[PDB]
Scaffold this active site. Structure first.
Site, PDB file in Angstrom:
ATOM      1  N   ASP A 279     -16.878   9.768 -27.020  1.00  0.00           N
ATOM      2  CA  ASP A 279     -17.631  10.025 -25.810  1.00  0.00           C
ATOM      3  C   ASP A 279     -19.030  10.469 -26.247  1.00  0.00           C
ATOM      4  OD1 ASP A 279     -17.897  12.806 -23.666  1.00  0.00           O
ATOM      5  OD2 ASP A 279     -18.085  10.730 -22.951  1.00  0.00           O
TER       6      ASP A 279
ATOM      7  N   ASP B 262     -14.641  15.306 -24.044  1.00  0.00           N
ATOM      8  CA  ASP B 262     -14.706  16.621 -23.403  1.00  0.00           C
ATOM      9  C   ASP B 262     -14.466  16.562 -21.897  1.00  0.00           C
ATOM     10  OD1 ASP B 262     -18.081  17.276 -22.386  1.00  0.00           O
ATOM     11  OD2 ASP B 262     -17.156  15.344 -22.743  1.00  0.00           O
TER      12      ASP B 262
ATOM     13  N   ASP C 129     -11.890  11.224 -20.320  1.00  0.00           N
ATOM     14  CA  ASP C 129     -11.480  10.936 -21.698  1.00  0.00           C
ATOM     15  C   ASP C 129      -9.970  11.097 -21.854  1.00  0.00           C
ATOM     16  OD1 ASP C 129     -14.130  10.448 -22.532  1.00  0.00           O
ATOM     17  OD2 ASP C 129     -14.489  12.570 -22.949  1.00  0.00           O
TER      18      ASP C 129
HETATM   19 MG   LIG Z   1     -18.344  13.960 -22.056  1.00  0.00          MG
END
Ligand SMILES: [Mg+2]
Ligand SMILES: *[C@@H]1O[C@H](CO)[C@@H](O[C@@H]2O[C@H](CO)[C@@H](O)[C@H](O)[C@H]2NC(C)=O)[C@H](O)[C@H]1NC(C)=O
Ligand SMILES: CC(C)CCC[C@@H](C)[C@H]1CC[C@H]2[C@@H]3CC=C4C[C@@H](O)CC[C@]4(C)[C@H]3CC[C@]12C
Ligand SMILES: *[C@@H]1O[C@H](CO)[C@@H](O)[C@H](O)[C@H]1NC(C)=O
Ligand SMILES: [K+]
Ligand SMILES: [Tl+]
Ligand SMILES: [Tl+]
Lengths: 268, 992, 39
Positions: B345, B686, B690
């Protein structure tokens, strides 16, 4: 193939052949040096045989010899081992002044034939007649068990002195020259009868010390025949034969450390 | 099952408000009926998420109790009770042997079960985190009246109302809104507020303004909407199910464990039954044939090995806990070392997740600011009088403020009330000009025009802090081009000057460059109003232009971006040097995604996309050979119409990949694509978007401070300080533990041979038993334990970060080379050293090696209390047994003595001990404690009963010393050959 | 000696055990010292 090619299969064989060959050659080398540090006449350690064991001829199934008097093949098993032992104490086996000697027909003192050396031939052993074993095919009724003290090189079995009290209190106490053997069971439902050298219920000290198989082959250890002409029948009788001495001790674990454990039963 | 959920969603934002009501039998104004709502409740079911069915811990524990070694140990334990049963019936055996050994072995299985159970842990509460995002209550309009209801009682069709501060209770079709902004970070990973209005604004429902989603929250304003989806049927409720439902799967390390279990189990059953028949042929009673088998089992199975592995893993996880890297699953300690591809990410992972000033354009010059958290860069300018003029506008023409009580925390980390751009500017000036509040106190704001959608600028009028003036200063900021159309002069190095086409062109150049860097650019200008035309009491009208907004003085430009975390660029390069492929997978827009890719080193300098080639050469993209482009940037909207085979080609054909504007399922798809090619993949993230990717990853790593609760539930590892450098450490630790496990496994296995061989020679030679079954367990469960563990503290023999990731198909934890060395070479030398001491003990007590062959018959005969030794002496039963058990004790101690050398040689696979040294203090500890244990077990009174361990004479300890030394020399010579010729012979044969 | 060679069939297993246990303990202490050089 499985793993590799032929060329690789060969190389892995040539390696392990030389490798294991070397290892075998090294192992053997260390065995050589071990043997080189040892005597031919006497073992390095003797503390593990120290207190002599007492073993008998009747091959006990489990410290027991039960049979039927009214049956032939009921005791023919115990007569096999009994014969095996006594067959060794033949007179034809003890011929000439070599390597046997006529010793006192009465319990005598020790005999030192020098040291544990080869500086002399075969150390001459005392003769022993199976004919000293009175009364004992064997006892088809009321067995005639034969006792034996385990051989230990350089061991001098020392009898107890009549200073204080004794089990068989002072009776026929040949204090100086006899290692006594008194069998027991309370529970006194038997009839103990002992046979041996000089008519004594012990081991004549003139058969000691033992010089070992290498310095004394054909050597004969003293026997003590014991007969139980018990007037009882059809019951397990726990009879314990005990030897007494200064160098004799016992253990709760080793039930053969200077004593017997016989479970006779004339179930007839 | 979940293949449906891996697809992009379909919606009804295209319908009119009225049309949408027909579909759901609803009223736009009155809302649903109390009766109709309750009807729909029973129909569709609750607005809730149901957690997936889990496997109870019962079945999880017992599943370990039947994995190769445990199976063999079970066969042994029962076979003990078998022989015991056969005894208790036949001849009354007052002993406890088979009974107790059967109890001991069954305990070994249970305890070993706990270790593997502890290792195979799965702490997963994905669906629980999602459930936390549904509010307890919602506001609905029913029978023309608004009431709060249990949010679970919400159904498709009713009229819902939301306002700033509340969570979207369900997927809504916006029908009415007033200044409504929403935080869609759940779906995008981006927290910038998105406007919501009734008007449809994109074909894509995840981008349109007239849809609001469950799992997000309203940030400001008010909105009303019609519920289109409820519970599991919402967009993120499906993501929830997808994430929670995904099959976990076996880790690389787990697969390795099972693999050597098969090997060792194989040789165990082989030799087991190979000698079971070999005994019956020799005329051994089944009574004995089973007793030998039990011994064979115990000899072949390394009883303490699986627990060693677990402890070595645990100890490695403890070290990483001490670098702010939390491991939730013990196996994930190794996966990072085997990782060949990282899918990362961007926002909050690679980046700080905070709009930060990156560059400034003043004095016809581009200046760069420091974007790093801890400010690890340098200054750009302080001297220029122009800077102070620009700095003043950035502070004054700004409505952002620091939250109360932050004075303790660093400037860049403190919470700010305001939009991202104003916060960035605030923190920029506060950093390099001190307290901004001071500047706003020295220059009192009298009138302002806040940033307007139409004006595209924000202006402010302040009382000049200067005493000699104390007059009125005008400042404004806005779109760079709009600010330009309002300027006549430029503050160059202090003094103003006319805005000639020259500087105007340099402005465009500066503007294009900063924008090309993916940075948001703002214009800044001011104007000192004429004193005579503006008295100290002159009133300014903000509603109607009461003051000039043209012919102003352009001061400068400022650019900003959500920047990389300081450690990220360097960590990315380090991953790439270790041969790990790094891919970006983000919900963010392509221009931003691509710019950070270059910033952190995902896309290296000079590498081009097909679009780059086309623009440079000024040719159509179809005219470009796509193989000429090693880099690519894929938008999610295009990803959607590509098959997996085509996704596989993208993955194969590019070294530098950026997946931008991806949905959560799309992240999962990219991860699966990478895995499909046979790669071990890590995911770093995070956000809740995700979660599926993190779950599917061989190892998911979540950020600890910036991470959402969901992401950290989906992960195997948490970076508690958001230190991306930890990934580099993790992969390094992962590789080190992999090598050290080999060392520890070889060490443990090596001692199997000296435990097997005595039992074999017992049969083939008919000699007294050299070593007992109990004695074996004193080794594998006792002495070898701490030494085997200590190998986990071994330093690397070379630069492990310099090698490529292991090939999980070829590079195994236990291979033929390990067995050859442990079983064929070193263990064989240990066996002899054991036997030697055995022959020494017996020969020194009177039983010379020659007379031992074929004596076991009379030796074991309990009724022969007069066995003749070599010297003609007679032994009772218990007397010779004491010597025999003393043989077991010295054979045992011989193993310990030969394991000394083995421990030292297993220290290194390649290097010499003279190179690696002896700096492992745990290992040395192992040596001392191992020897202490052995001595205690031999000399402690009573151990001769409980373990049949007998006191050894001093000379006995030294029997195996020459064998211990040969091991050290042999292995040192062998490894000397390895190093001296990287060719292959010694290497390809023995190099673990 | 001659008939008084009782020492030939004797071993001080008691002292050996005392010494063996002393050694085991001291090796245990030494090990702790080296391990505790940093914990
Ligand atoms: Mg992120
Ligand atoms: C040791 O003495 C025993 C005494 O019983 C011998 O047994 C003799 O066996 C033969 C042939 O089987 C019989 O004819 C005799 O009746 C047995 N007794 C005697 C006194 O001769 C046995 O053969 C002898 N063993 C050896 C090796 O000489
Ligand atoms: C007690 C004694 C008699 C048993 C001796 C067993 C010997 C023959 C065994 C023990 C370990 C074995 C080796 C272990 C490892 C390998 C590597 C593999 O790729 C091919 C087989 C090979 C080379 C084995 C061949 C046979 C081997 C050398
Ligand atoms: C033993 O045998 C002798 C003959 O040799 C006999 O006189 C005696 O009665 C026997 N003794 C016993 C107790 O039976
Ligand atoms: K995972
Ligand atoms: Tl084992
Ligand atoms: Tl082992």
């Amino acid at each position: 193939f499985l793993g590799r090619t032929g060329s690789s299969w060969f190389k892995i064989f040539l390696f392990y052949l030389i490798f294991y060959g070397c290892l075998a050659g090294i192992f053997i080398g260390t065995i050589q040096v071990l043997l080189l540090t040892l005597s031919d006449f006497e073992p390095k350690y003797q503390d593990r045989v120290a207190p002599p064991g007492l073993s008998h001829a009747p091959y006990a199934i489990k410290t027991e010899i039960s049979f039927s008097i009214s049956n032939p093949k009921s005791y023919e098993s115990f007569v096999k081992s009994m014969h095996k032992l006594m067959d060794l104490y033949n007179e034809s086996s003890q011929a000439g002044n070599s390597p046997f000697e006529d010793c006192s027909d009465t319990p005598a003192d020790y005999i030192k034939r020098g040291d544990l050396d080869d500086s002399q031939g075969q150390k001459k052993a005392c003769r022993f007649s199976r004919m000293w074993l009175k009364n004992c095919g064997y006892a088809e009724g009321k067995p005639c068990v034969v006792a034996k003290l385990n051989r230990i090189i350089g061991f001098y079995p020392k009898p107890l002195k009549n200073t204080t009290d004794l089990p068989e209190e002072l009776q026929a106490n040949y204090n100086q020259y006899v290692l006594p053997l008194r069998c027991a069971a309370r529970e006194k439902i038997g009839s103990i009868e002992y046979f041996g050298l000089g008519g004594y219920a012990g081991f004549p000290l003139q058969y000691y010390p033992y010089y070992g198989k290498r310095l004394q082959k054909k050597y004969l250890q003293p026997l003590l025949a014991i007969q139980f002409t018990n007037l009882t029948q059809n019951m397990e009788l726990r009879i314990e034969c005990k030897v007494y001495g200064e160098n004799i001790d016992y253990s709760e674990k080793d039930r053969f450390r200077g004593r017997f454990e016989v479970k006779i039963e004339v179930k007839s | 099952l979940d293949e449906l959920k891996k697809e992009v969603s379909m919606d009804d934002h295209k319908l009119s408000l009225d049309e949408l009501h027909n579909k759901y039998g609803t009223d736009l104004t009155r809302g649903l009926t109390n009766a109709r709502a309750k009807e729909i409740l029973a129909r569709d079911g609750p607005n809730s998420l149901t957690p997936p069915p889990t496997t109870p811990e019962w079945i999880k524990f017992c599943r370990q109790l039947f994995g190769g070694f445990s199976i063999l140990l079970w066969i042994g334990a029962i076979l003990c009770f078998l022989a015991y049963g056969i005894q208790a019936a036949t001849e009354d055996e007052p002993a406890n042997d088979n009974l107790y050994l059967g109890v001991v072995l069954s305990t070994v299985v249970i305890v070993t079960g706990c270790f593997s159970y502890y290792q195979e842990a799965k702490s997963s509460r994905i669906m629980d985190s999602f459930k936390n995002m549904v509010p307890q209550q919602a506001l609905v309009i029913r029978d023309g009246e608004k009431s709060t209801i249990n949010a679970e009682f919400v159904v498709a069709g009713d009229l819902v109302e939301v306002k700033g501060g509340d969570r979207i209770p369900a997927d809504l079709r916006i029908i009415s809104a007033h200044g409504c902004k929403v935080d869609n970070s759940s779906l995008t990973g981006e927290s910038e507020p998105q406007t919501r209005s009734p008007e449809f604004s994109s074909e894509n429902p995840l981008e349109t303004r007239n849809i609001a989603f469950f799992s997000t929250n309203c940030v400001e304003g008010t909105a009303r909407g019609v519920v289109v989806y409820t519970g599991d049927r919402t967009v993120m409720g499906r993501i929830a199910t997808l994430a929670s439902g995904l099959e976990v799967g076996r880790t690389p390390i787990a697969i390795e464990i099972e693999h050597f279990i098969h090997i060792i189990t194989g040789v165990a059953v082989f030799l087991g039954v190979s000698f079971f028949i070999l005994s019956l042929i020799l005329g051994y009673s089944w009574l004995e044939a089973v007793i030998f088998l039990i011994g064979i089992i115990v000899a072949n199975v390394p009883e303490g090995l699986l627990a060693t592995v677990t402890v070595c893993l645990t100890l490695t996880a403890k070290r990483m806990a001490r670098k702010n890297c939390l491991v939730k699953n013990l196996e994930a300690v190794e996966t990072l070392g085997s990782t060949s591809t990282i899918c990362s990410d961007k926002t909050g992972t690679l980046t700080q997740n905070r709009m930060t000033v990156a560059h400034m354009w003043f004095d016809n010059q581009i200046h760069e600011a420091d974007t790093t958290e801890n400010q690890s860069g340098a200054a750009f300018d302080k001297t220029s009088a122009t800077w102070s003029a620009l700095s003043r506008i950035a502070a004054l023409c700004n409505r952002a403020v620091f939250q109360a009580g932050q004075d303790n925390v660093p400037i860049l980390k403190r919470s700010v009330a305001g939009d991202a751009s104003e916060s960035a500017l605030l923190k920029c000036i506060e950093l390099c000009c001190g307290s901004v509040q001071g500047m706003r106190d020295r220059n009192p704001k009298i009138v302002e025009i806040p940033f307007n959608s139409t004006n595209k600028y924000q202006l402010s009028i302040h009382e000049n802090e200067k005493s000699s003036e104390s007059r009125y200063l005008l400042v404004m900021k806005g779109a760079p081009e709009r600010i330009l159309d309002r300027c006549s002069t430029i503050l160059l190095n202090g003094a103003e000057e006319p805005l000639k086409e020259d500087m105007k062109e340099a402005f465009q150049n500066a503007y294009l460059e900063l924008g090309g860097l993916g940075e948001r650019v703002l214009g800044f200008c001011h104007f000192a109003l004429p004193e005579d035309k503006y008295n100290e009491g002159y009133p300014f009208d903000a509603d109607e232009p009461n003051f000039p907004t043209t012919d102003l003085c352009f001061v400068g430009l400022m650019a900003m971006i959500d920047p990389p975390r300081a450690a990220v660029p360097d960590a990315v390069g380090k991953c790439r040097s270790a041969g790990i492929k790094v891919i970006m997978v983000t919900g963010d827009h392509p221009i931003t995604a691509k710019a950070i890719a270059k910033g952190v080193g995902i896309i290296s300098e000079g590498n081009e996309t097909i679009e780059d080639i086309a623009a440079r050469l000024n040719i159509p993209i179809g005219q470009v050979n796509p193989r000429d482009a090693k880099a690519c940037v894929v938008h999610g909207s295009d990803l959607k119409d590509l098959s997996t085979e085509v996704l596989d080609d993208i993955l194969h054909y590019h070294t530098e990949i950026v997946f931008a504007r991806t949905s959560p399922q799309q992240k999962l798809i990219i991860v699966e694509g990478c895995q499909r090619q046979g790669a071990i993949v890590a995911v770093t993230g995070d956000g809740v978007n995700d979660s599926p990717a993190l779950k599917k990853a061989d190892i998911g790593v979540a950020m600890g401070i910036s991470g959402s609760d969901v992401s950290k539930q989906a992960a195997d590892m948490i970076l508690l300080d958001d230190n991306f450098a930890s990934i580099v450490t993790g992969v390094e630790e992962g590789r080190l533990i992999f090598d050290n496990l080999k060392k520890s496994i070889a060490y443990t296995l090596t001692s199997n041979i000296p435990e097997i061989t005595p039992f074999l020679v017992f049969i083939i030679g008919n000699v007294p038993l050299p070593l007992g079954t109990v004695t074996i367990l004193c080794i594998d469960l006792g002495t070898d334990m701490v030494p085997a563990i200590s190998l986990a503290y071994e330093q690397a023999e070379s630069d492990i970060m310099k090698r490529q990731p292991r090939n999980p198909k070829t590079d195994k934890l236990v291979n033929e080379r390990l067995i050859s060395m442990a079983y064929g070479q070193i263990g064989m030398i240990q066996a002899l050293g054991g036997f030697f001491s055995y022959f020494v003990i017996l020969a020194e007590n009177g039983f010379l090696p020659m007379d031992l062959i074929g004596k076991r018959v009379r030796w074991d005969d309990r009724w022969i209390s007069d066995v003749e030794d070599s010297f003609g002496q007679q032994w009772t039963y218990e007397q010779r047994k004491i010597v025999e058990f003393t043989c077991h004790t010295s054979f045992f101690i011989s193993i310990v003595v030969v394991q000394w050398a083995d421990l030292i040689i297993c220290k290194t696979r390649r290097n010499s001990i003279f190179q690696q040294g002896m700096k492992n203090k745990i290992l040395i500890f192992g040596l001392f404690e191992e020897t202490a244990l052995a001595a205690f077990l031999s000399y402690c009174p009573g151990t001769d009963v409980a373990l049949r361990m007998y006191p050894l004479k001093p000379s006995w300890w030294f029997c195996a010393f020459p064998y211990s030394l040969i091991i050290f020399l042999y292995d040192e010579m062998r490894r000397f050959i390895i190093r001296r010729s990287p060719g292959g012979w010694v290497e390809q044969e023995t190099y673990y | 000696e001659g008939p008084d060679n009782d020492e030939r069939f004797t071993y001080d297993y008691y002292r050996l055990r005392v010494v063996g246990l002393i050694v085991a303990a001291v090796l245990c202490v030494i090990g702790i010292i080296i391990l505790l050089a940093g914990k």
